[PDB]
Amino acid sequence: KKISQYACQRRTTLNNYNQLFTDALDILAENDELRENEGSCLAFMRASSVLKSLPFPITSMKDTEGIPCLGDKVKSIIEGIIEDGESSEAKAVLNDERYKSFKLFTSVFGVGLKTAEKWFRMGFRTLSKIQSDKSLRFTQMQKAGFLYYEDLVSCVNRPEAEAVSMLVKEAVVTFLPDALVTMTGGFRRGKMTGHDVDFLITSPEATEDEEQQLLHKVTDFWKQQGLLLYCDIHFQKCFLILKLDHGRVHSEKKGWKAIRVDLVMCPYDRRAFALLGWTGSRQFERDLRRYATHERKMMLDNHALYDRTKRVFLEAESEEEIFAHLGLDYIEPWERNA
Ligand SMILES: [Mg+2]
Ligand SMILES: [Zn+2]
Ligand SMILES: [Zn+2]
Ligand SMILES: [Zn+2]
Ligand SMILES: [Zn+2]
Ligand SMILES: [Zn+2]
Ligand SMILES: [Zn+2]
Ligand SMILES: [Zn+2]
Numbered sequence: 001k002k003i004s005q006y007a008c009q010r011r012t013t014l015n016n017y018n019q020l021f022t023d024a025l026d027i028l029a030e031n032d033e034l035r036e037n038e039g040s041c042l043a044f045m046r047a048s049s050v051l052k053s054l055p056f057p058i059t060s061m062k063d064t065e066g067i068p069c070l071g072d073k074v075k076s077i078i079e080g081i082i083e084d085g086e087s088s089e090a091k092a093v094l095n096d097e098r099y100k101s102f103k104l105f106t107s108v109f110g111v112g113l114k115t116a117e118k119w120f121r122m123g124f125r126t127l128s129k130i131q132s133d134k135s136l137r138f139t140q141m142q143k144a145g146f147l148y149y150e151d152l153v154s155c156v157n158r159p160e161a162e163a164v165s166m167l168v169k170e171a172v173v174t175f176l177p178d179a180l181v182t183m184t185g186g187f188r189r190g191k192m193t194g195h196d197v198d199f200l201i202t203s204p205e206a207t208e209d210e211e212q213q214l215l216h217k218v219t220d221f222w223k224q225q226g227l228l229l230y231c232d233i234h235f236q237k238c239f240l241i242l243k244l245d246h247g248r249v250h251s252e253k254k255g256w257k258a259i260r261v262d263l264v265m266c267p268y269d270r271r272a273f274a275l276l277g278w279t280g281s282r283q284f285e286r287d288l289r290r291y292a293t294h295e296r297k298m299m300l301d302n303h304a305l306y307d308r309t310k311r312v313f314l315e316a317e318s319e320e321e322i323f324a325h326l327g328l329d330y331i332e333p334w335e336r337n338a
Helices: 019-029 041-053 072-084 088-094 097-106 112-121 127-133 141-149 149-153 157-176 208-227 268-279 282-298 319-325
Strands: 178-183 198-204 228-232 237-243 256-265 299-300 305-307
Touching: 019 041, 019 072, 019 088, 041 072, 041 282, 072 088, 097 112, 097 127, 141 149, 141 178, 141 228, 149 256, 157 178, 157 198, 157 208, 157 237, 157 256, 198 268, 208 228, 208 237, 208 256, 268 282, 268 319, 282 299
Parallel strands: 198 256
Antiparallel strands: 178 198, 228 237, 237 256, 299 305
């Protein structure tokens, strides 16, 4: 059976037989500025995505026959990796003078490409020099990023994500006893680590006002308890840093860890669309929307599914119903790691 050009028509599990190729493509897709080779970041992303779906490792150029999304530029990168196990193109990005600084600066919560670039052009190369500088001005997000750096740079693991889930559920149930709280993002796709923990909160009985007030109630409750380290409030959402007591963690192993937490509140009837959107991966979501537009003349996003031919919104109480409306075989969350 031929491999679809769409990630939403492939099953992509975390059992990647092509990590040598994918890690190089991901470096090239992530570093457009630092790159010296002709090719598009979209072409690198789609090629990395198809390779992730393969049930076998590429061991020769003949293995690439019949695989879509492998352009001439991508095939030269695959060729170079087969040749000695490394990509000269990815290696040039890794050896680029700005690369190390950009990775380092953007690893701070509140620091994006614009700020990383500003600091690099000022002559900064280390966080220690940035933090101790007397002339620099930091946003409140960056101050939290620097204060809790070590904890935030350690990625969150599953026992920690689950301990956060318990905290979220206890806070949410206090104000909305009928609320459904679902962990989304990478953890829902079977990942063992993450840079943060995402949740989708919905309530079958909440009014428009109760649902607007919930995130404010929960964050105030955490502030009173001394757990809120940072807070910033399409759907209503908040980006937080929570104080997690390691005594709440059920694992094999300061007494606390700073954890980045994202909370999304959605109306009950749109829960399936928000769940689908927040589960990801980013490439899976991109392909689902591209397939819906180009193959079905449908408009899909985190809030709804609209049929442009019938001029009607399509309702769904589950992700399964969305796939069915799209004429797609159902792809389980752990199979969406495109
Ligand atoms: Mg996440
Ligand atoms: Zn730039
Ligand atoms: Zn690009
Ligand atoms: Zn831990
Ligand atoms: Zn997130
Ligand atoms: Zn235990
Ligand atoms: Zn398009
Ligand atoms: Zn919308």
